Design a protein around this ligand. Structure first.
Ligand SMILES: Nc1nc2c(ncn2[C@@H]2O[C@@H]3COP(=O)(O)O[C@H]3[C@H]2O)c(=O)[nH]1
Ligand SMILES: Nc1nc2c(ncn2[C@@H]2O[C@@H]3COP(=O)(O)O[C@H]3[C@H]2O)c(=O)[nH]1
Ligand SMILES: Nc1nc2c(ncn2[C@@H]2O[C@@H]3COP(=O)(O)O[C@H]3[C@H]2O)c(=O)[nH]1
Ligand SMILES: Nc1nc2c(ncn2[C@@H]2O[C@@H]3COP(=O)(O)O[C@H]3[C@H]2O)c(=O)[nH]1
Lengths: 434, 450, 450, 450
């Protein structure tokens, strides 16, 4: 495609994953080639081929692929081929990528350290992989693990360089010289940065200096990795921890006043159902963080159609309807619980978002006049009254766990003073029925 | 039929199925790695494994009988429950758990009991029981700490089994890193084998070292990987334990942070010693009588009806003691008990004063309040629990002597806890039932003339 | 009674009971585990034990004499205090702690001082003293760090005693893990025994290791258990101390977080360097004079009475210099002190502009303010501290031009820390005293006629 | 000129006085403990000490020239500054630091550099410079990392000096724990001495062990105390690192939690897939363009004038394009920009709908507006950056085709960010500037003519 957008078109994610693999090969393979003798002339062609392939990926990305990305300028996405290339040239990431690709002919693998400077591609890949896939905290755990492994990798390479500088097998501290020759240095690195100990003691001044600096760096490095892991697992379970903390605060509140186990069981059941269904403990707390337009659009999608159908609300201003939806509050009623009781007045409009309620009638109740399902609206007549002059004609009982959007008097009345035409229209409708 | 997941019998069955799962997660790997433990108690492990398989079968049956919540309602018909279970991944996990892999005992002998690793796929039942136990128990943070300690024990035990199996594969007594030779009578004991393996597991997972260094590439790889696990998995669980311990004293930490902030403010402003001691006495009184917790923040996320059910039981004595409320209102009190906010007053202070605008109505909960003229040398009458005052400044009578101002002042002897009823909240809760208000105008008519 | 637990006398006794409790928590296990410590200083330990028991009797007498709160009032009746103490669990804990077990000295011998392992059941007094000190002391973070370090020292000392006991039960010198032989002159010293046990406990609990490996199964099990204690119980307290030392300057941390947020906003928005320098200078001024703390968000947890008293006490010098109140009877200042909202203005800042519809009245507490001309160069009147201004636009008066607009513009010559009384809140307070109203109106007419 | 504390020259002198305090807090104890360090470089140490003393004298002079604030005004009077400086404890500390103890070098020889430990009492200037740096630096977390690392280096260096002094007092080579014999040329090197002491201190203070076990009782006591101090230090390091990490991820983790919450809300509420996709794209645009931060919460701590001019400087490109700002009045924007609330709109959103009552007036700073008809295809006119609309509904006109209603369907083409200004707040600003009001009404009448 001529124009590629980052939000979708997962082929962009795949290519960028290939770029991240090339960058990871450069970052992980330069120190293990500079320090260790693994870059033998017997297999130098394999190393050169892999480096040339990574450079080819870098060149392809900087020249033909990145210039096809469409950008936003003043809220408008630009699709022109020349404009995308010009904004790429003006971008900082192209300058970093161009500084990354430099010709260093001079076989030394330490000359490819510019290739490690293409780090903004990795951070962008991180951002999109947080965007595309749900449960992104496991990728953050994997990424912090990879950071710790790369730090251990670098420490192992430095330790092997120091051992080769002093001479392998010269004393107990340096690498003795038998084995895989990389897992031994990685063992030294993992025992040094995390500061387990158990390593051979350093004898010479250079060895003691290296061990001192390595332990001092590794203390802060290990602190950084454990802090990142703690922050990631805290952010993953921040909602769970907050919900649990609120639940046990309520439980100890009811236990402090010796509230009977029936009410406590009802409260715990409501907490469990709310957390399992909504995924959150409050709705207004999330709603107020969103912008006003997004909150209004969310209100329209969920229940504007339901509000529009009812006859009393018909004839209103459009903004009249749009304002009342932002003030509907979601309340969960437990099964076999009376939403409305006969003998008490009504001032609350009830919109059944989920579940079903039963209207009780006949002698002493105990009969179902109607079973209102989701989307059914009852109690609207209670809104339009002088106040206290209306009564619930029949008992309304929640047959199951029912989520109802509620609008109540003196919360709609403060919306009426905003729109006088709606005020007089609702007054005329109220006096017409009575 | 049906089994209700919210019922107590479902939790009892969760406890009854967790024990086979915990036994499988503990003892199967131990018998697989420590072969003597498989051979010495074969007549016991066979019975325990058959009992665990029977309980697994009964659990599979239970999951074909328990209901699920759709549209907030519990399903009662058996066919829909069976279809819902069979269409879920849990049925596949249970089938893979109860695959008859024990028939491989004939081919592989009794020496290899790791054919029962498929039965660890019912970890969902154990996790569900642990999740349900947190809400049910009265000490949930303690249970969560104990569960994390149990997870630590499981990880350490599994690492001990892995280390012993790796030493067995490499060879006992071959090197200084592996477990020593079994033919040694000191290390030949099964208890010694498991306990030394647990020792190595604990010191390697907790990043202690103090173990013989690896001498082989495979040993080096396993040691590096196991310290990696201890840094990444073990230390994360330890930090989680610290987090739960901090959340145990989160209220303590927040209240003490408030006290420290107030004292630091008063330290810089050079507040007098008497006022500082008064503030310290007030905070010490709040801590001593367990009044640090506020019901407004605790009960923030609750339905109005459920919060009414909570608040009626807490304040049952006070609202039944007051004559006007819970006797003539007939439903207005339910609206009032949410709007009332608790407030504590120090001894000797004036809750309300003459000539000051009154914005709320005051209802006594557990306080002793007196009526004084100007200074408090003499008191006309003491107000016991349930007596109400301050309603005159909220609503005025026709032809009132005074308007929007307090007629008298009430002094607080002792530390008085009492409800507050805001003017706008009282207006909202009073416009709904005008009928019971006539006693309030009667009282106002009697008390304003004198 | 009574002892008045909120008083200073009860707190002074809380320290006098904390010392025997800490001694019993510290040295009873030391005498029990180290036989030489009990045997060598037996007279000193007997004297200290008798003193601690006497203080325990006095503490029980105090708890009988201490006064609780019923109906918010202190209880002076002795029999009611006896019934309240005895019905509590604390009486049972004190009795069980004070059961005389010293008779077992005649049965088990003088070398068994673990019979006093009940006298540390009175940990409630020590914990109450620590909770009361944390509120009372001027350095709560330092005291919390010291208390948790004391808990660490107690845990390490107890683990040292346990390790020495396990070495004693197994036998000294039987294994390389246990404490060496007592017959050794270097290791036979009591000081050496205790300090090597302390060193071993410090290595094991602080996750160091560097100890001889265990030889026996019981030794391996105890090492595993104690390393788990060090990782779980010890390191949680360690992390708590780390977080507390990291969060010693909570107000400074919040201020710095605000600085980082504003600086990141300025860096992202490419604001000019001069504006960033001005913001940095303003925040340096805020931090240097300790204006970073906001008493509106700090004192809001206090009751309104005590918050008003603190606000009176802090600003006692500047409100008495204001001529619009605290003049006729020095009683008006109580009402409007809560409505004072403190504001800080930079030099060269026009606090009041000509023609603006001012919604508040500003009372100068700190800083020098100038009445400015139209051009902005000529200043007519320089207003010092205690001089009120901006009182024209708040209230409308008959026969005046621009009643809802400022008659003059006011700038701050230097930094000014002045309150702003709102327009609506002053109307409530000014209606009480008509003399203040007519004085303000007369002064306004006098300054407005020209 | 006098020296102002907020100026950059005071910061420069803070750095120039921190440099000798850096030298004195580290090298003085090193020369005191490492005698070969003092003896070999005696000329260099004498020159550096004399330079540090001269800088201390100049700092004492500067403290007299530093001008504090009385009544928010800089104190330029020399005598008042002299009296203020000498009254503080800092003058006593500076006098104690500069007490001549170099004369004790004649009595105590050249091998006693710890007589200059009184010069460590100027740590206040060091900490004042370091807290001044943290506020003004553009990289505060990098500086916090550097500050913590340098503090750990200083403490490790001091503990290394303490360990070397302890080894010197006990005797080099007498025990395996102490530093080995200095007569051995490999151990006798000064660099070797300092580096191994620093290595021992790093191992002990960062909880690694890997040191020879103590032999003497005093060595055991010192090692236990040093290990406990090191555990506290490592805990402080971990707490600081975690706090810093949390602070860096404060905004990002909160935004991601908001993303997870809105996704869960949409999954629960059966929100349509088109709106869900639009909202996810909206949030991706907000995060990628760094528009998720709000100006109200970050900048609320700033003064109103400072925040207003910051908002002017940030939006300087778009405010000049608006026909009401910097066109006729040139100075309405400084008082009106505080009332502008930023808002973001996704593509396809409707800013206003024809037939709807108007509430705010919209100012475009970025984005493109369609002004679409009812069909949804054709656009009457395109709106660019720096424009304004929505003003004719809130403006009151006696003769209007539509009364207090929107006259067009405004549609955002894509991701338009606007400033909304409430009607009443605009009317407050419009009354003070009648010239700005008249042209706005003329433009409204002209646009309502057609
Ligand atoms: N009384 C009664 N109410 C019904 C019936 N069917 C539905 N309802 C609804 O039950 C509601 C109870 O509260 P309202 O009286 O406000 O409004 C009532 C109607 O919306 C019916 O057959 N009888
Ligand atoms: N004026 C007056 N008020 C009383 C008396 N006894 C109780 N009160 C209450 O004290 C309250 C103080 O505030 P209000 O004037 O609002 O209402 C007053 C009454 O509710 C009394 O004897 N005289
Ligand atoms: N107009 C005027 N105001 C003064 C003078 N001295 C002090 N002020 C105060 O400056 C204030 C500016 O705002 P206001 O007009 O509200 O009230 C004004 C007075 O309170 C003076 O001499 N003339
Ligand atoms: N009526 C009208 N308004 C326009 C036109 N072009 C831009 N606008 C602006 O769009 C605004 C929408 O809200 P208003 O009706 O308050 O005011 C409108 C004008 O400011 C146009 O062609 N006709």
């Amino acid at each position: 495609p001529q124009s590629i957008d980052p939000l979708t078109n997962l082929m962009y994610v795949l290519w960028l994953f290939f770029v991240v693999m090339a960058w990871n090969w450069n970052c992980w393979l330069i120190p293990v080639r500079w320090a260790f003798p693994y870059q033998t002339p017997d297999n130098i062609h394999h190393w050169l081929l892999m480096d040339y392939l990574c450079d080819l990926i870098y060149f392809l990305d900087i020249t033909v692929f990145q210039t096809r990305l469409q950008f936003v300028r003043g809220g408008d996405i630009i699709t022109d081929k020349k404009d995308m290339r010009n904004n790429y040239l003006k971008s900082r990431r192209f300058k970093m990528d161009l500084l990354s690709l430099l010709p260093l002919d001079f076989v030394n693998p330490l000359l490819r350290l510019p290739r490690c400077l293409k780090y903004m591609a990795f951070f962008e890949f991180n951002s999109r992989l947080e965007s595309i896939l749900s449960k992104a905290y496991v990728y953050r755990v994997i990424r912090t693990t990879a950071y710790l492994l790369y730090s251990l990798h670098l420490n192992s390479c430095l330790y092997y360089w120091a051992s080769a500088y002093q001479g392998l097998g010269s004393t107990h501290w340096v690498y003795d010289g038998v084995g895989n020759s990389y897992i031994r240095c990685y063992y030294f690195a993992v025992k040094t940065l995390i500061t387990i100990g158990g390593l051979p003691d350093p004898k010479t001044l250079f060895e003691i200096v290296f061990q001192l600096l390595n332990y001092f760096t590794g203390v802060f490095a290990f602190s950084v990795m454990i802090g990142q892991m703690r922050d990631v697992v805290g952010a993953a379970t921040a909602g769970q921890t907050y919900y649990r903390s609120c639940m046990d605060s309520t439980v100890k509140y009811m236990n402090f006043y010796k509230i009977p186990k029936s009410v406590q069981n009802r409260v715990k059941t409501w907490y469990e159902y709310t957390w399992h269904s909504q995924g959150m403990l409050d709705e207004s707390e999330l709603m107020v963080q969103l912008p006003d337009k997004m909150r209004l659009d969310l209100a329209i999608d969920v229940n504007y159609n339901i509000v529009s159908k009812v006859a009393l609300f018909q004839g209103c201003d459009r903004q009249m309807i749009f304002d009342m939806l932002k003030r509907l509050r979601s309340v969960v009623y437990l099964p076999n619980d009376y939403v409305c009781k006969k003998g008490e007045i009504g001032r609350e409009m009830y919109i059944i978002q989920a579940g079903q309620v039963q209207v009780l009638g006949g002698p002493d109740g105990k009969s179902v006049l109607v079973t209102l399902k989701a989307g059914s609206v009852f109690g609207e007549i209670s809104l339009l009254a002088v106040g206290g002059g209306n009564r619930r004609t029949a008992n309304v009982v929640a047959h199951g766990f029912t989520n109802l959007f509620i609008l109540d008097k003196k919360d709609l009345n403060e919306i009426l003073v905003h729109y006088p035409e709606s005020q007089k229209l609702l007054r005329k409708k109220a006096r017409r029925m009575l | 039929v049906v089994i209700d997941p919210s019922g107590n019998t479902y939790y009892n069955w969760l406890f009854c199925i967790t024990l086979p799962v915990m036994y499988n997660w503990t003892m199967v790997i131990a018998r697989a790695c420590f072969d003597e433990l498989q051979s010495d108690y074969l007549e016991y492990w066979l019975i325990l494994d058959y009992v665990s398989d029977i309980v697994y079968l009964i659990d599979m049956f239970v999951r074909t009988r328990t209901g699920y919540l759709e549209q907030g309602l519990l399903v009662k018909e058996e066919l829909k429950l069976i279809n819902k279970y069979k269409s879920n991944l849990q049925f596949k996990l249970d089938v893979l758990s109860l695959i008859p892999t024990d028939l491989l005992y004939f081919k592989l002998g009794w020496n290899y009991p790791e054919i029962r690793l498929n039965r660890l796929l019912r970890f969902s039942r154990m996790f569900e029981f642990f999740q349900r136990t947190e809400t049910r128990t009265n000490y949930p943070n303690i249970f969560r700490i104990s569960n994390l300690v149990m997870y630590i024990v499981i990880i350490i035990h599994w690492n001990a089994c892995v280390f012993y199996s790796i030493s067995k594969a490499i060879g006992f007594g071959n090197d200084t890193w592996v477990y020593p030779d079994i033919n040694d009578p000191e290390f030949g004991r099964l208890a010694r084998k498991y306990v030394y393996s647990l020792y190595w597991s604990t010191l390697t997972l907790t990043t202690i070292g103090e173990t013989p260094p690896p001498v082989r590439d495979s040993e080096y790889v396993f040691v590096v990987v196991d310290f990696l696990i201890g840094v990444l998995i073990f230390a994360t669980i330890v930090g989680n334990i610290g987090s739960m311990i901090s959340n145990m004293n989160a209220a303590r930490a927040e209240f003490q942070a408030r006290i420290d902030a107030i004292k630091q403010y008063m330290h810089f402003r050079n507040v007098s010693k008497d006022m500082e001691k008064r503030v310290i006495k007030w905070f010490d009184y709040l801590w001593t009588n367990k009044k640090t917790v506020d019901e407004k923040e605790v009960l923030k996320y609750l339905p109005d009806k459920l919060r009414a059910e909570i608040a009626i039981n807490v304040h049952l004595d006070t609202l039944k003691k007051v004559r006007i409320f819970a006797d003539c209102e007939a439903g207005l009190l339910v609206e009032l008990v949410l709007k009332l906010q608790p407030q504590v007053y120090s001894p000797g202070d004036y809750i309300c004063k003459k000539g000051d605008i009154g914005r709320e109505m005051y209802i006594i909960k557990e306080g002793k309040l007196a009526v004084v003229a100007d200074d408090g040398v003499t008191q006309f009458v003491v107000l016991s629990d349930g007596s109400y005052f301050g309603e005159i400044s909220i609503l005025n009578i026709k032809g009132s002597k005074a308007g929007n101002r307090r007629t008298a002042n009430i002094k607080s002897i002792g530390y008085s806890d009492l409800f507050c009823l805001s003017k706008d909240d009282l207006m909202e809760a009073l416009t709904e039932y005008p009928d019971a208000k006539t006693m309030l105008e009667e009282k106002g008519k009697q008390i304003l003339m004198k």
